[PDB]
Structures are given as C-alpha cells and as structure tokens.
Amino acid sequence: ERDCRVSSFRVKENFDKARFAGTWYAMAKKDPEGLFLQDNIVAEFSVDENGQMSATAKGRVRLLNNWDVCADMVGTFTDTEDPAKFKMKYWGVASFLQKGNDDHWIIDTDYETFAVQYSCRLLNLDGTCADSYSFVFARDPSGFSPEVQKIVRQRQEELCLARQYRLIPHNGYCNG
C-alpha cells in the first residue's frame, strides 16, 4: 500500500534554515554502500546573511587499512524548488577523505529536539532507492522522549527504512 518511490516521500513543510542552525548529535544511522562515518558523529549547521546554509561535522572513520581517524568534514548546501530538499557538496579537511555531491533532504524536524535526514544516492529503475543513507539527530546527547521516539519510528517507516538503523555511540573519540 504505502509507496517506496523516492518521489513520493514527504519532507518538512516550510523548512526554516535559520531555526535548524546549531549543533546536532547523531543518535542513529542507516548506512549506504561503502560506508564512511562510523560513529561519534556531531554536526554543526550554519546559515549566512544571504540564506546560504553550510555545515561542518566530525566523526570516526575506519580507514580501509584499519587505522581509525577523526574526519573533519565540510558541506555547502544549494537550495531547490522544495525548501526541504537541498543538493550538498562535501569534502574533508584531509585530502584523503571522501568528497562528492549528494541530495540532502530534511524529512522531519521540530527544530528543538530531533531531525530526520535522508539521501538516496542511486535510484532503481522503478523509482525506489537502490542506495540510501539516513541520520536521526538530536539536540541533546541524552536523546529523545518516548513521545519523540514514536514520531521518529513513523518517519522511518515512511522512508521504507524501518528496522534498518543502528544506534551511534559517542565516547569522545574525536574529542567529545
């Protein structure tokens, strides 16, 4: 019944870039193929005078060679016809870190407690997502109330990603 085509997923109505600014702690994540960013992920979003949103993030990355490293990442966002859907250009301070461009959609947020983000990197021929990623963020590192958890589970189902997220630990690895 419920549809899994990317094009039918709802996004945050009248998304407010200025109210979304600030620190966000990743509480859970659904990984894409060839995952990057393992844990200890914290993002800081900013909006300039002209309305251009940007963000920085820190997180542990397991190098293919088994070294663990703390990645310092940067992303700039371009607005689209949908205030909640952006195109994100990203790179790291260290040249060996992943660089690219991915869609960045704000599925839902209350601005003060939680946010649900989603990106589909590759579309299947049917319109469904063949490779996606999603982060659940919180304003407080302690988490969300049960009432918010209820809303998050629902959005997760709506993205056809129910049961596919893992909890993200924070142990100060990248200084936290």
UniProtKB/Swiss-Prot annotation:
InterPro entries the UniProt entry points to:
Calycin (IPR012674), Lipocalin_ApoD (IPR022271), Lipocalin_CS (IPR022272), Lipocln_cytosolic_FA-bd_dom (IPR000566), Retinol-bd/Purpurin (IPR002449)
Q: Which GO terms describe its molecular function?
A: retinal binding; retinol binding; retinol transmembrane transporter activity
Task: Provide the tissue specificity.
Answer: Detected in blood plasma (at protein level).
Disulfide bridge positions per record: C4-C160, C70-C174, C120-C129
Q: Which GO terms describe its biological process?
A: retinol transport
Q: Is Disulfide bond found in the keyword set?
A: yes
Q: Where in the cell is it found?
A: Secreted
Q: What family is it from?
A: Belongs to the calycin superfamily. Lipocalin family.
Q: What does this protein do?
A: Retinol-binding protein that mediates retinol transport in blood plasma. Delivers retinol from the liver stores to the peripheral tissues. Transfers the bound all-trans retinol to STRA6, that then facilitates retinol transport across the cell membrane.
Q: What is this protein called?
A: Retinol-binding protein 4
Organism name: Bos taurus
Q: Which gene encodes it?
A: RBP4
